[PDB]
PDB file of C-alpha atoms in Angstrom:
ATOM      1  CA  UNK W  30      60.062  61.703  38.686  1.00  0.00           C
ATOM      2  CA  UNK W  31      60.563  62.041  43.170  1.00  0.00           C
ATOM      3  CA  UNK W  32      60.091  64.568  45.139  1.00  0.00           C
ATOM      4  CA  UNK W  33      59.410  64.950  48.902  1.00  0.00           C
ATOM      5  CA  UNK W  34      58.956  61.160  49.597  1.00  0.00           C
ATOM      6  CA  UNK W  35      56.396  60.754  45.815  1.00  0.00           C
ATOM      7  CA  UNK W  36      57.018  58.862  42.822  1.00  0.00           C
ATOM      8  CA  UNK W  37      54.983  60.666  39.754  1.00  0.00           C
ATOM      9  CA  UNK W  38      54.600  60.160  36.411  1.00  0.00           C
ATOM     10  CA  UNK W  39      53.263  61.440  32.557  1.00  0.00           C
ATOM     11  CA  UNK W  40      50.011  60.410  34.195  1.00  0.00           C
ATOM     12  CA  UNK W  41      49.538  62.262  37.568  1.00  0.00           C
ATOM     13  CA  UNK W  42      49.881  65.426  35.116  1.00  0.00           C
ATOM     14  CA  UNK W  43      46.090  66.747  34.632  1.00  0.00           C
ATOM     15  CA  UNK W  44      46.410  66.808  30.762  1.00  0.00           C
ATOM     16  CA  UNK W  45      43.916  69.915  29.847  1.00  0.00           C
ATOM     17  CA  UNK W  46      41.639  69.523  26.651  1.00  0.00           C
ATOM     18  CA  UNK W  47      43.029  71.287  23.962  1.00  0.00           C
ATOM     19  CA  UNK W  48      40.048  72.617  22.478  1.00  0.00           C
ATOM     20  CA  UNK W  49      39.986  74.428  25.984  1.00  0.00           C
ATOM     21  CA  UNK W  50      43.092  76.579  25.520  1.00  0.00           C
ATOM     22  CA  UNK W  51      43.051  79.593  23.356  1.00  0.00           C
ATOM     23  CA  UNK W  52      46.633  81.816  22.799  1.00  0.00           C
ATOM     24  CA  UNK W  53      46.189  85.602  23.330  1.00  0.00           C
ATOM     25  CA  UNK W  54      49.961  86.734  22.899  1.00  0.00           C
ATOM     26  CA  UNK W  55      53.310  85.862  22.969  1.00  0.00           C
ATOM     27  CA  UNK W  56      55.821  87.062  26.213  1.00  0.00           C
ATOM     28  CA  UNK W  57      59.119  85.541  25.468  1.00  0.00           C
ATOM     29  CA  UNK W  58      61.474  82.797  24.905  1.00  0.00           C
ATOM     30  CA  UNK W  59      64.543  80.832  25.766  1.00  0.00           C
ATOM     31  CA  UNK W  60      66.828  78.147  24.475  1.00  0.00           C
ATOM     32  CA  UNK W  61      63.879  76.421  23.433  1.00  0.00           C
ATOM     33  CA  UNK W  62      60.659  76.898  22.764  1.00  0.00           C
ATOM     34  CA  UNK W  63      58.419  79.769  23.538  1.00  0.00           C
ATOM     35  CA  UNK W  64      55.640  81.388  26.125  1.00  0.00           C
ATOM     36  CA  UNK W  65      52.365  82.500  25.215  1.00  0.00           C
ATOM     37  CA  UNK W  66      49.558  84.378  27.156  1.00  0.00           C
ATOM     38  CA  UNK W  67      46.690  81.708  27.388  1.00  0.00           C
ATOM     39  CA  UNK W  68      43.159  81.027  28.353  1.00  0.00           C
ATOM     40  CA  UNK W  69      41.648  78.077  29.901  1.00  0.00           C
ATOM     41  CA  UNK W  70      38.071  76.889  29.465  1.00  0.00           C
ATOM     42  CA  UNK W  71      35.718  73.539  29.013  1.00  0.00           C
ATOM     43  CA  UNK W  72      32.805  76.566  28.661  1.00  0.00           C
ATOM     44  CA  UNK W  73      32.076  78.274  25.513  1.00  0.00           C
ATOM     45  CA  UNK W  74      31.388  81.039  26.544  1.00  0.00           C
ATOM     46  CA  UNK W  75      33.023  81.193  30.069  1.00  0.00           C
ATOM     47  CA  UNK W  76      32.585  85.105  31.626  1.00  0.00           C
ATOM     48  CA  UNK W  77      35.578  84.287  33.661  1.00  0.00           C
ATOM     49  CA  UNK W  78      38.183  81.535  31.934  1.00  0.00           C
ATOM     50  CA  UNK W  79      41.356  80.954  33.919  1.00  0.00           C
ATOM     51  CA  UNK W  80      44.177  83.249  32.301  1.00  0.00           C
ATOM     52  CA  UNK W  81      47.613  81.135  31.943  1.00  0.00           C
ATOM     53  CA  UNK W  82      51.379  81.024  30.336  1.00  0.00           C
ATOM     54  CA  UNK W  83      51.593  78.706  27.626  1.00  0.00           C
ATOM     55  CA  UNK W  84      54.882  77.237  27.404  1.00  0.00           C
ATOM     56  CA  UNK W  85      55.410  75.167  23.918  1.00  0.00           C
ATOM     57  CA  UNK W  86      57.793  72.712  22.974  1.00  0.00           C
ATOM     58  CA  UNK W  87      59.383  72.888  18.770  1.00  0.00           C
ATOM     59  CA  UNK W  88      58.046  70.382  16.912  1.00  0.00           C
ATOM     60  CA  UNK W  89      61.095  69.996  15.566  1.00  0.00           C
ATOM     61  CA  UNK W  90      62.494  68.217  18.556  1.00  0.00           C
ATOM     62  CA  UNK W  91      64.419  64.905  19.308  1.00  0.00           C
ATOM     63  CA  UNK W  92      63.046  62.534  21.902  1.00  0.00           C
ATOM     64  CA  UNK W  93      65.533  63.888  24.628  1.00  0.00           C
ATOM     65  CA  UNK W  94      64.269  67.015  23.861  1.00  0.00           C
ATOM     66  CA  UNK W  95      60.363  66.037  24.056  1.00  0.00           C
ATOM     67  CA  UNK W  96      61.164  64.044  27.433  1.00  0.00           C
ATOM     68  CA  UNK W  97      63.326  66.731  29.329  1.00  0.00           C
ATOM     69  CA  UNK W  98      59.575  68.843  28.667  1.00  0.00           C
ATOM     70  CA  UNK W  99      57.529  66.401  30.104  1.00  0.00           C
ATOM     71  CA  UNK W 100      60.307  66.179  32.900  1.00  0.00           C
ATOM     72  CA  UNK W 101      59.706  70.274  33.546  1.00  0.00           C
ATOM     73  CA  UNK W 102      56.263  69.227  33.918  1.00  0.00           C
ATOM     74  CA  UNK W 103      56.533  66.829  36.677  1.00  0.00           C
ATOM     75  CA  UNK W 104      59.062  69.426  37.983  1.00  0.00           C
ATOM     76  CA  UNK W 105      57.018  72.340  38.556  1.00  0.00           C
ATOM     77  CA  UNK W 106      53.621  70.402  39.111  1.00  0.00           C
ATOM     78  CA  UNK W 107      55.375  68.270  42.702  1.00  0.00           C
ATOM     79  CA  UNK W 108      56.305  71.583  44.351  1.00  0.00           C
ATOM     80  CA  UNK W 109      53.683  72.879  46.009  1.00  0.00           C
ATOM     81  CA  UNK W 110      55.033  76.902  47.532  1.00  0.00           C
ATOM     82  CA  UNK W 111      53.508  80.021  47.032  1.00  0.00           C
ATOM     83  CA  UNK W 112      56.657  81.506  45.498  1.00  0.00           C
ATOM     84  CA  UNK W 113      57.171  79.294  42.976  1.00  0.00           C
ATOM     85  CA  UNK W 114      54.667  79.003  40.054  1.00  0.00           C
ATOM     86  CA  UNK W 115      52.553  76.645  39.906  1.00  0.00           C
ATOM     87  CA  UNK W 116      52.032  74.335  36.770  1.00  0.00           C
ATOM     88  CA  UNK W 117      47.889  74.359  36.039  1.00  0.00           C
ATOM     89  CA  UNK W 118      48.565  71.197  33.707  1.00  0.00           C
ATOM     90  CA  UNK W 119      49.704  70.164  30.312  1.00  0.00           C
ATOM     91  CA  UNK W 120      48.278  69.638  26.989  1.00  0.00           C
ATOM     92  CA  UNK W 121      50.163  66.827  25.645  1.00  0.00           C
ATOM     93  CA  UNK W 122      48.457  65.258  23.547  1.00  0.00           C
ATOM     94  CA  UNK W 123      48.472  67.675  20.980  1.00  0.00           C
ATOM     95  CA  UNK W 124      50.972  69.256  18.666  1.00  0.00           C
ATOM     96  CA  UNK W 125      53.094  72.037  19.943  1.00  0.00           C
ATOM     97  CA  UNK W 126      53.212  70.205  23.673  1.00  0.00           C
ATOM     98  CA  UNK W 127      51.977  72.525  26.273  1.00  0.00           C
ATOM     99  CA  UNK W 128      52.751  73.181  29.833  1.00  0.00           C
ATOM    100  CA  UNK W 129      50.222  75.456  31.721  1.00  0.00           C
ATOM    101  CA  UNK W 130      51.665  77.827  34.061  1.00  0.00           C
ATOM    102  CA  UNK W 131      50.844  80.218  36.672  1.00  0.00           C
ATOM    103  CA  UNK W 132      50.180  83.852  34.644  1.00  0.00           C
ATOM    104  CA  UNK W 133      53.129  85.965  35.906  1.00  0.00           C
ATOM    105  CA  UNK W 134      52.113  90.028  34.242  1.00  0.00           C
ATOM    106  CA  UNK W 135      54.947  90.888  36.012  1.00  0.00           C
ATOM    107  CA  UNK W 136      57.723  89.264  33.854  1.00  0.00           C
ATOM    108  CA  UNK W 137      61.102  88.312  34.311  1.00  0.00           C
ATOM    109  CA  UNK W 138      62.462  89.853  37.602  1.00  0.00           C
ATOM    110  CA  UNK W 139      65.539  90.924  35.389  1.00  0.00           C
ATOM    111  CA  UNK W 140      63.813  93.131  33.062  1.00  0.00           C
ATOM    112  CA  UNK W 141      61.626  94.233  35.205  1.00  0.00           C
ATOM    113  CA  UNK W 142      64.438  95.766  37.175  1.00  0.00           C
ATOM    114  CA  UNK W 143      66.094  97.430  33.648  1.00  0.00           C
ATOM    115  CA  UNK W 144      62.514  98.899  32.961  1.00  0.00           C
ATOM    116  CA  UNK W 145      61.448  99.966  36.324  1.00  0.00           C
ATOM    117  CA  UNK W 146      65.385 101.545  37.251  1.00  0.00           C
ATOM    118  CA  UNK W 147      63.913 105.219  38.809  1.00  0.00           C
ATOM    119  CA  UNK W 148      64.951 107.683  35.594  1.00  0.00           C
ATOM    120  CA  UNK W 149      63.322 111.291  35.830  1.00  0.00           C
ATOM    121  CA  UNK W 150      60.273 110.392  33.576  1.00  0.00           C
ATOM    122  CA  UNK W 151      59.602 107.550  36.523  1.00  0.00           C
ATOM    123  CA  UNK W 152      60.947 108.971  39.577  1.00  0.00           C
ATOM    124  CA  UNK W 153      59.636 106.663  42.328  1.00  0.00           C
ATOM    125  CA  UNK W 154      58.756 103.662  40.457  1.00  0.00           C
ATOM    126  CA  UNK W 155      60.644 101.706  42.535  1.00  0.00           C
ATOM    127  CA  UNK W 156      61.799 101.650  46.700  1.00  0.00           C
ATOM    128  CA  UNK W 157      63.799  99.727  48.930  1.00  0.00           C
ATOM    129  CA  UNK W 158      61.641  98.191  50.347  1.00  0.00           C
ATOM    130  CA  UNK W 159      60.356  97.008  46.585  1.00  0.00           C
ATOM    131  CA  UNK W 160      64.043  95.542  46.469  1.00  0.00           C
ATOM    132  CA  UNK W 161      63.585  93.391  50.043  1.00  0.00           C
ATOM    133  CA  UNK W 162      60.312  92.455  49.680  1.00  0.00           C
ATOM    134  CA  UNK W 163      61.274  90.512  46.673  1.00  0.00           C
ATOM    135  CA  UNK W 164      64.471  89.241  47.945  1.00  0.00           C
ATOM    136  CA  UNK W 165      62.445  87.837  50.826  1.00  0.00           C
ATOM    137  CA  UNK W 166      59.978  86.107  48.222  1.00  0.00           C
ATOM    138  CA  UNK W 167      62.646  84.022  46.276  1.00  0.00           C
ATOM    139  CA  UNK W 168      64.967  83.058  49.460  1.00  0.00           C
ATOM    140  CA  UNK W 169      61.377  81.827  50.960  1.00  0.00           C
ATOM    141  CA  UNK W 170      60.929  80.065  47.476  1.00  0.00           C
ATOM    142  CA  UNK W 171      64.229  78.860  48.140  1.00  0.00           C
ATOM    143  CA  UNK W 172      64.295  77.400  51.851  1.00  0.00           C
ATOM    144  CA  UNK W 173      60.777  75.502  50.517  1.00  0.00           C
ATOM    145  CA  UNK W 174      63.587  73.764  47.945  1.00  0.00           C
ATOM    146  CA  UNK W 175      66.161  73.745  50.858  1.00  0.00           C
ATOM    147  CA  UNK W 176      64.103  71.453  53.603  1.00  0.00           C
ATOM    148  CA  UNK W 177      62.491  69.485  50.211  1.00  0.00           C
ATOM    149  CA  UNK W 178      66.497  69.012  49.683  1.00  0.00           C
ATOM    150  CA  UNK W 179      65.850  70.248  45.877  1.00  0.00           C
ATOM    151  CA  UNK W 180      68.670  71.883  44.354  1.00  0.00           C
ATOM    152  CA  UNK W 181      68.145  74.579  41.987  1.00  0.00           C
ATOM    153  CA  UNK W 182      71.688  75.220  40.263  1.00  0.00           C
ATOM    154  CA  UNK W 183      70.762  78.832  38.854  1.00  0.00           C
ATOM    155  CA  UNK W 184      69.115  80.794  40.866  1.00  0.00           C
ATOM    156  CA  UNK W 185      69.423  83.932  38.823  1.00  0.00           C
ATOM    157  CA  UNK W 186      66.966  87.055  38.164  1.00  0.00           C
ATOM    158  CA  UNK W 187      66.373  85.405  34.599  1.00  0.00           C
ATOM    159  CA  UNK W 188      64.396  82.532  36.145  1.00  0.00           C
ATOM    160  CA  UNK W 189      62.411  84.700  38.156  1.00  0.00           C
ATOM    161  CA  UNK W 190      58.990  85.627  37.369  1.00  0.00           C
ATOM    162  CA  UNK W 191      57.124  88.797  38.885  1.00  0.00           C
ATOM    163  CA  UNK W 192      52.876  88.498  39.541  1.00  0.00           C
ATOM    164  CA  UNK W 193      52.547  92.111  38.434  1.00  0.00           C
ATOM    165  CA  UNK W 194      54.042  95.018  37.575  1.00  0.00           C
ATOM    166  CA  UNK W 195      53.439  96.984  40.709  1.00  0.00           C
ATOM    167  CA  UNK W 196      52.390  97.385  44.159  1.00  0.00           C
ATOM    168  CA  UNK W 197      51.625  93.984  45.706  1.00  0.00           C
ATOM    169  CA  UNK W 198      54.076  92.049  43.140  1.00  0.00           C
ATOM    170  CA  UNK W 199      55.108  88.633  44.026  1.00  0.00           C
ATOM    171  CA  UNK W 200      58.619  87.303  42.555  1.00  0.00           C
ATOM    172  CA  UNK W 201      58.621  83.609  42.460  1.00  0.00           C
ATOM    173  CA  UNK W 202      61.233  81.145  40.953  1.00  0.00           C
ATOM    174  CA  UNK W 203      60.190  80.262  37.750  1.00  0.00           C
ATOM    175  CA  UNK W 204      62.998  78.618  35.382  1.00  0.00           C
ATOM    176  CA  UNK W 205      63.680  74.886  36.481  1.00  0.00           C
ATOM    177  CA  UNK W 206      65.680  73.922  33.252  1.00  0.00           C
ATOM    178  CA  UNK W 207      69.306  73.181  35.117  1.00  0.00           C
ATOM    179  CA  UNK W 208      68.038  71.370  37.200  1.00  0.00           C
ATOM    180  CA  UNK W 209      65.663  69.331  35.269  1.00  0.00           C
ATOM    181  CA  UNK W 210      68.452  68.769  33.136  1.00  0.00           C
ATOM    182  CA  UNK W 211      70.770  67.355  35.925  1.00  0.00           C
ATOM    183  CA  UNK W 212      67.941  65.290  37.191  1.00  0.00           C
ATOM    184  CA  UNK W 213      67.970  63.337  34.000  1.00  0.00           C
ATOM    185  CA  UNK W 214      71.234  62.731  32.796  1.00  0.00           C
ATOM    186  CA  UNK W 215      73.332  64.434  35.399  1.00  0.00           C
ATOM    187  CA  UNK W 216      74.656  67.087  33.566  1.00  0.00           C
ATOM    188  CA  UNK W 217      74.276  70.169  31.638  1.00  0.00           C
ATOM    189  CA  UNK W 218      73.996  67.295  28.713  1.00  0.00           C
ATOM    190  CA  UNK W 219      73.083  70.260  26.056  1.00  0.00           C
ATOM    191  CA  UNK W 220      74.968  73.331  26.937  1.00  0.00           C
ATOM    192  CA  UNK W 221      78.846  73.589  27.308  1.00  0.00           C
ATOM    193  CA  UNK W 222      81.509  75.458  29.120  1.00  0.00           C
ATOM    194  CA  UNK W 223      80.495  78.660  27.304  1.00  0.00           C
ATOM    195  CA  UNK W 224      76.730  78.435  27.974  1.00  0.00           C
ATOM    196  CA  UNK W 225      77.296  77.456  32.122  1.00  0.00           C
ATOM    197  CA  UNK W 226      76.474  80.269  34.885  1.00  0.00           C
ATOM    198  CA  UNK W 227      79.518  80.840  36.084  1.00  0.00           C
ATOM    199  CA  UNK W 228      78.621  84.150  37.307  1.00  0.00           C
ATOM    200  CA  UNK W 229      75.633  82.557  39.672  1.00  0.00           C
ATOM    201  CA  UNK W 230      78.383  79.702  40.530  1.00  0.00           C
ATOM    202  CA  UNK W 231      80.433  78.930  43.839  1.00  0.00           C
ATOM    203  CA  UNK W 232      84.080  77.588  43.990  1.00  0.00           C
ATOM    204  CA  UNK W 233      83.199  74.276  44.641  1.00  0.00           C
ATOM    205  CA  UNK W 234      80.589  74.481  41.965  1.00  0.00           C
ATOM    206  CA  UNK W 235      83.015  75.191  38.604  1.00  0.00           C
ATOM    207  CA  UNK W 236      86.200  73.636  40.162  1.00  0.00           C
ATOM    208  CA  UNK W 237      84.980  70.479  41.432  1.00  0.00           C
ATOM    209  CA  UNK W 238      80.982  69.866  40.078  1.00  0.00           C
ATOM    210  CA  UNK W 239      79.963  69.662  43.571  1.00  0.00           C
ATOM    211  CA  UNK W 240      76.862  70.859  44.438  1.00  0.00           C
ATOM    212  CA  UNK W 241      75.128  71.329  47.752  1.00  0.00           C
ATOM    213  CA  UNK W 242      72.028  73.277  49.204  1.00  0.00           C
ATOM    214  CA  UNK W 243      75.358  76.213  49.530  1.00  0.00           C
ATOM    215  CA  UNK W 244      75.304  76.136  45.780  1.00  0.00           C
ATOM    216  CA  UNK W 245      71.693  77.737  45.898  1.00  0.00           C
ATOM    217  CA  UNK W 246      72.830  80.090  48.816  1.00  0.00           C
ATOM    218  CA  UNK W 247      76.203  81.416  47.030  1.00  0.00           C
ATOM    219  CA  UNK W 248      73.867  81.763  43.751  1.00  0.00           C
ATOM    220  CA  UNK W 249      71.338  83.757  46.179  1.00  0.00           C
ATOM    221  CA  UNK W 250      74.193  86.476  46.798  1.00  0.00           C
ATOM    222  CA  UNK W 251      74.392  86.753  43.281  1.00  0.00           C
ATOM    223  CA  UNK W 252      70.966  87.093  42.546  1.00  0.00           C
ATOM    224  CA  UNK W 253      70.703  89.997  45.648  1.00  0.00           C
ATOM    225  CA  UNK W 254      73.178  91.776  43.822  1.00  0.00           C
ATOM    226  CA  UNK W 255      71.834  91.954  41.055  1.00  0.00           C
ATOM    227  CA  UNK W 256      68.187  93.334  42.551  1.00  0.00           C
ATOM    228  CA  UNK W 257      69.815  96.087  44.456  1.00  0.00           C
ATOM    229  CA  UNK W 258      71.544  96.878  41.314  1.00  0.00           C
ATOM    230  CA  UNK W 259      68.392  96.855  39.883  1.00  0.00           C
ATOM    231  CA  UNK W 260      69.838  94.973  36.915  1.00  0.00           C
ATOM    232  CA  UNK W 261      73.371  95.127  35.806  1.00  0.00           C
ATOM    233  CA  UNK W 262      74.802  91.785  34.365  1.00  0.00           C
ATOM    234  CA  UNK W 263      77.380  90.430  37.732  1.00  0.00           C
ATOM    235  CA  UNK W 264      81.131  91.235  37.492  1.00  0.00           C
ATOM    236  CA  UNK W 265      79.444  93.610  34.764  1.00  0.00           C
ATOM    237  CA  UNK W 266      83.426  94.740  33.916  1.00  0.00           C
ATOM    238  CA  UNK W 267      84.237  90.498  33.896  1.00  0.00           C
ATOM    239  CA  UNK W 268      84.160  88.022  31.727  1.00  0.00           C
ATOM    240  CA  UNK W 269      83.462  84.370  33.000  1.00  0.00           C
ATOM    241  CA  UNK W 270      87.330  82.825  33.007  1.00  0.00           C
ATOM    242  CA  UNK W 271      88.656  86.294  34.701  1.00  0.00           C
ATOM    243  CA  UNK W 272      85.014  85.827  36.766  1.00  0.00           C
ATOM    244  CA  UNK W 273      86.280  82.179  37.555  1.00  0.00           C
ATOM    245  CA  UNK W 274      90.169  83.286  38.562  1.00  0.00           C
ATOM    246  CA  UNK W 275      88.593  86.333  40.646  1.00  0.00           C
ATOM    247  CA  UNK W 276      86.195  84.640  42.440  1.00  0.00           C
ATOM    248  CA  UNK W 277      88.877  81.786  43.540  1.00  0.00           C
ATOM    249  CA  UNK W 278      91.173  83.682  44.605  1.00  0.00           C
ATOM    250  CA  UNK W 279      88.755  85.261  47.040  1.00  0.00           C
ATOM    251  CA  UNK W 280      87.940  88.600  44.813  1.00  0.00           C
ATOM    252  CA  UNK W 281      83.916  89.634  45.383  1.00  0.00           C
ATOM    253  CA  UNK W 282      81.682  92.008  44.103  1.00  0.00           C
ATOM    254  CA  UNK W 283      81.385  95.747  45.024  1.00  0.00           C
ATOM    255  CA  UNK W 284      78.250  96.650  46.872  1.00  0.00           C
ATOM    256  CA  UNK W 285      75.601  98.032  44.440  1.00  0.00           C
ATOM    257  CA  UNK W 286      75.371 101.713  44.058  1.00  0.00           C
ATOM    258  CA  UNK W 287      74.292 103.225  47.238  1.00  0.00           C
ATOM    259  CA  UNK W 288      72.899  99.895  48.759  1.00  0.00           C
ATOM    260  CA  UNK W 289      72.750  99.522  52.637  1.00  0.00           C
ATOM    261  CA  UNK W 290      75.484  98.087  54.364  1.00  0.00           C
ATOM    262  CA  UNK W 291      73.059  95.681  56.138  1.00  0.00           C
ATOM    263  CA  UNK W 292      71.692  93.997  52.513  1.00  0.00           C
ATOM    264  CA  UNK W 293      75.583  93.896  51.864  1.00  0.00           C
ATOM    265  CA  UNK W 294      76.338  91.914  54.797  1.00  0.00           C
ATOM    266  CA  UNK W 295      74.109  89.138  53.490  1.00  0.00           C
ATOM    267  CA  UNK W 296      75.914  89.027  49.798  1.00  0.00           C
ATOM    268  CA  UNK W 297      79.500  88.774  51.420  1.00  0.00           C
ATOM    269  CA  UNK W 298      78.064  85.834  54.066  1.00  0.00           C
ATOM    270  CA  UNK W 299      76.312  84.140  50.932  1.00  0.00           C
ATOM    271  CA  UNK W 300      80.070  84.257  49.058  1.00  0.00           C
ATOM    272  CA  UNK W 301      81.914  82.939  51.811  1.00  0.00           C
ATOM    273  CA  UNK W 302      84.455  80.528  50.410  1.00  0.00           C
ATOM    274  CA  UNK W 303      83.584  77.282  52.350  1.00  0.00           C
ATOM    275  CA  UNK W 304      80.153  76.249  51.956  1.00  0.00           C
ATOM    276  CA  UNK W 305      80.235  75.050  55.492  1.00  0.00           C
ATOM    277  CA  UNK W 306      80.341  78.919  56.173  1.00  0.00           C
ATOM    278  CA  UNK W 307      77.713  80.262  54.316  1.00  0.00           C
ATOM    279  CA  UNK W 308      73.671  80.989  56.060  1.00  0.00           C
ATOM    280  CA  UNK W 309      71.476  78.107  55.270  1.00  0.00           C
ATOM    281  CA  UNK W 310      68.133  79.845  53.861  1.00  0.00           C
ATOM    282  CA  UNK W 311      66.130  79.811  56.885  1.00  0.00           C
ATOM    283  CA  UNK W 312      69.165  82.514  58.475  1.00  0.00           C
ATOM    284  CA  UNK W 313      68.843  84.540  54.848  1.00  0.00           C
ATOM    285  CA  UNK W 314      65.524  84.937  55.228  1.00  0.00           C
ATOM    286  CA  UNK W 315      65.945  85.977  58.936  1.00  0.00           C
ATOM    287  CA  UNK W 316      68.335  88.569  58.058  1.00  0.00           C
ATOM    288  CA  UNK W 317      66.676  89.781  55.169  1.00  0.00           C
ATOM    289  CA  UNK W 318      63.843  90.575  57.593  1.00  0.00           C
ATOM    290  CA  UNK W 319      65.799  92.473  59.745  1.00  0.00           C
ATOM    291  CA  UNK W 320      67.047  94.665  57.274  1.00  0.00           C
ATOM    292  CA  UNK W 321      62.750  95.322  56.213  1.00  0.00           C
ATOM    293  CA  UNK W 322      62.767  96.486  60.002  1.00  0.00           C
ATOM    294  CA  UNK W 323      66.095  98.941  59.917  1.00  0.00           C
ATOM    295  CA  UNK W 324      64.071 102.623  59.092  1.00  0.00           C
ATOM    296  CA  UNK W 325      67.897 103.303  57.837  1.00  0.00           C
ATOM    297  CA  UNK W 326      68.164 100.315  55.361  1.00  0.00           C
ATOM    298  CA  UNK W 327      64.051 100.835  54.026  1.00  0.00           C
ATOM    299  CA  UNK W 328      64.567 104.800  53.939  1.00  0.00           C
ATOM    300  CA  UNK W 329      67.519 104.594  51.718  1.00  0.00           C
ATOM    301  CA  UNK W 330      66.847 106.208  47.894  1.00  0.00           C
ATOM    302  CA  UNK W 331      67.654 104.337  44.776  1.00  0.00           C
ATOM    303  CA  UNK W 332      70.011 106.076  42.139  1.00  0.00           C
ATOM    304  CA  UNK W 333      68.253 108.127  39.905  1.00  0.00           C
TER     305      UNK W 333
END
């Protein structure tokens, strides 16, 4: 695997001894495998073990799944940016295989937005600035990927994570499974039409299979909508095909409920039909920052 002018393999991954790893609790699962909270320590008893998330590989898997799992580790390990989850190391010499990741106690961004929606029992659980900070965090991650010529291909709330639920939380890109599949096979290899994230994809991506850094720009727009709608599914009344037809004919989503105009404007700029008309992430960040500077934007009430 090559990134930012460097090539690496399985051996550059820090293999941590299996006996040093303890599983604490289940956190979740994606399509394939599980994620657990864990602790690492080479010392009994260790007053302060390193807390981690542990992503597992099902033992019942193909040799292609194993290589997929390997590639996920390498990809994460090669990033170096505060808005991308860290890889602490791996435990590949024991079964089931582990990838050790930065623990993100806030969980995934979609789930967080749904669960932390303001509603009588939690009237001010979240404010406009919280949403702008999450957006800026992910935009920073995306800019880092852009400058390093890495196309994520699935910039969505389900793929982002939070360091904690409360104030001070930092949003980070966590799931690189899509890019991994393309890097290994050249196409979505275990997927198919029904599994494609078409609701996050620009016209040239789903029509021509053309992906650039302007692909991620489009997707980031949809993520902005997700953030400012407080976790609704994009194009909520529409199926994937209806979205395909809607988007290709120039259709775009309305603003989320209570969304400030400057924020909505950023979404529509990200959704320009021609990729060359879409902003790069440095511009997106600049425009997000400008939003945070506007008291009228940040003093806007979220809907209850």
